[PDB]
Design goal:
Chains A, B: Homodimer. The structure is a homodimer. Chain A is an alpha/beta fold. In chain A, 44% of the residues lie in helices and 14% in strands.
Chain lengths: 402, 402
């Protein structure tokens, strides 16, 4: 019997995605072929271990699939080693941490409020429970990272691992300087590029590979691949260590169907069209931030060098939570986001984060940004209304989905 | 541009799957509809949090999907709470351990050599790295667990958590006795039913729900669902604590397309036809074990109560490694497995584990087991040959895949 109830819900989700403007910076739309690989029969095989060295037999074909994913990732980012088995960006980070540190060791990451990710030291996350955390933020004036403050904290606290990368920082990172700092205290530099991995692949963001000891990322988000994790490094000896922490350390059987999707995504990212897409992502972001600033909205750091930006809603008397609900009401999805030195708690926040990867995949162009800016503005000042919901629907329906 | 190279491999794996006999106990073949859900657009949504309390907007449909998987899991297993977000059986176990213990605490699990799983205390796994481990096994004379030995160890070591369940144990578990031992020393009882979850759902195996504090499982294996984890309990208060460990504790965004596939798998398991399939799984295992015994092999414990059984190859002078290779050469996949107090090292062993869930899904019935038993015996005694490989291929092809 077909589970009609379940598939009807899936059909409702396809409609919502099609009829709305997804502006959540960590979302994107995967291609049909990525979905074909993920929904393949590769899910029927337990391939514990690594190519050429599996626990069980019958993996001759799976080994070639995983290997291709491995080699493509290396070629894409210019790495000497890769591990494509992490179930998620969180499991990727978990494995690296456990391979380089012992519980109790000091880990240094970006403050969640300043833009860091949950896995960079939050007390409610495994990162802050097992390790002693030290956090760096941004300057109160420019809202940019101050490398001398980072250096100071590093010399004072002497972390075993320093993490660069974030989920809500709109500017470029100086990986060379971060490595220098790490070298001064004998720490490992781990760069979590999950957010900007796609921009690095396209050459539109500084590559961390030559400076970091280890690099982690998701395969989804700007890279536009299936939901999952990835780990890279220019040091294969360190790589062997980390392979052990993924398996048998923290995971069991890998999701080979997903890994086949990663191979496909790396294949797509290697095509000239991917660079053109990424360029538009950035152009769309800058232009959208600009159109919103022209309307009286304050953009954190004043702009962006990447795919996302943060809007400070304090001047407009709106909490991030309220903005998110009003926009969601008309088919515009974002997520409330704490801003640097946010007076309000994390459950409320004072701002919202916006990203363009998703709508750029749907063919939105910089010339359309003024229209998107208008709808967002109206939704925040005038609140939700049927006519506004319709205007959003028509705009979205005019752009196809992959 | 289609990734031809990758898709050519997928087609080769499908062929491999069609033309062989899969006897690895942890394997199965998912339905087309399970794959359709896993390959859906639900992968595009970021949905950190739980239904009604998410960290992003636009989750209204996703919440219905996840609630549906949760409610069907509760109805299927007779539970008060469920968490459907674990990426795998391993992350399900990790979340529970971290919710109940602090690093340094003592965990009691089944010795790997006796049938336990890597996550039940292995030194190379997070379980044996974060916690102190005490293991229990089987008796050399009964080849079964000794509840008196378990109790003695529990009183002597006072573990904070005792895990029941294993990956290669062919007999029923006395969950009541385990809970008594756990209460006597003040420990939590965790039952990992990953291997036999399908049988529990079909009511052919004692249900651990009323006796354990928490139950973990995989959604694949006997349950025949997509690869992923699951957590259940009769205690909602304990559940709430565990929900926090899954997120923001150890995971980030959930794989909602996989959760949809889980909901589908639960729907399939709630149908009477699933009880018939499971009944056949057990009859096939019992019958196959008898046919092999009749041909000169000894069955550990003398038989089986579930979907798997261990073959003692000593009567024929073979090691599990040799048997593994000879069988793999004619298209029959099994895995070596140590027998109780094996006279051979762990990388060699004197036995193999065999499971029928996969071939049963392919339509094999008890009357055909004698034939399967003959092919296995010929392969082990005559060794690989083209004529035998062809006979396996044809038999396999005569039994379609879902």
């Amino acid at each position: 019997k077909r589970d009609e109830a379940l598939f009807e819900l899936i059909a409702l989700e396809e409609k919502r995605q099609r009829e709305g403007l997804e502006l959540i910076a960590s979302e994107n739309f995967v291609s049909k072929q990525v979905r074909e690989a993920v929904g393949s029969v590769l899910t029927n095989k337990y391939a514990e271990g690594y190519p050429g060295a599996r626990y069980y037999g019958g993996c001759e074909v799976i080994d070639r699939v995983e290997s291709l994913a491995i080699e493509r990732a290396k070629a894409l980012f210019g790495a000497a080693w890769a591990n494509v088995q992490p179930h998620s960006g969180s499991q990727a980070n978990m494995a690296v941490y456990m391979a380089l540190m012992e519980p109790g060791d000091t880990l240094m990451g970006m403050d969640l409020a300043a833009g860091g990710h949950l896995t960079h030291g939050s007390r409610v996350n495994f990162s802050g429970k097992l390790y002693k955390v030290v956090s760096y933020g941004v300057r109160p004036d420019t809202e940019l990272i101050d490398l001398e403050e980072v250096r100071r904290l590093a010399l004072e606290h002497r972390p075993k691992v320093i993490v660069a990368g974030a989920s809500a920082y709109p500017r470029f990172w100086d990986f060379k300087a971060f490595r220098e700092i790490a070298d001064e205290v004998g720490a490992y530099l781990v760069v979590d590029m999950a957010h900007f991995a796609g921009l690095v692949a396209a050459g539109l963001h500084p590559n961390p590979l030559p400076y970091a000891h280890v690099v982690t990322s998701t395969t989804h988000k700007t890279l536009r691949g299936p939901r999952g994790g990835l780990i890279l490094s220019n040091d294969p000896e360190l790589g062997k260590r980390i392979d052990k922490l993924i398996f048998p350390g923290i995971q069991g059987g890998p999701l080979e169907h997903v890994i086949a999707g990663k191979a496909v995504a790396f294949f797509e990212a290697l095509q000239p069209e991917f660079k053109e897409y990424s360029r538009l992502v950035v152009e769309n972001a800058k232009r959208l931030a600009e159109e919103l600033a022209r309307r009286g909205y304050r953009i954190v750091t004043g702009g962006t060098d990447n795919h996302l930006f943060l809007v400070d809603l304090r001047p407009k008397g709106l909490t991030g939570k309220e903005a998110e609900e009003r926009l969601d009401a008309v088919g515009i999805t974002v997520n409330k986001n704490a801003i640097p030195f946010d007076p309000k708690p994390p459950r409320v926040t004072s701002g919202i984060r916006i990203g363009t990867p998703a709508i750029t995949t749907r063919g939105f162009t910089p010339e359309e940004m003024p229209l998107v800016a208008e709808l967002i503005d109206r939704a925040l000042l005038e609140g939700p209304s049927e006519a506004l919901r319709e205007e959003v629907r028509r705009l979205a329906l005019a752009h196809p989905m992959p």
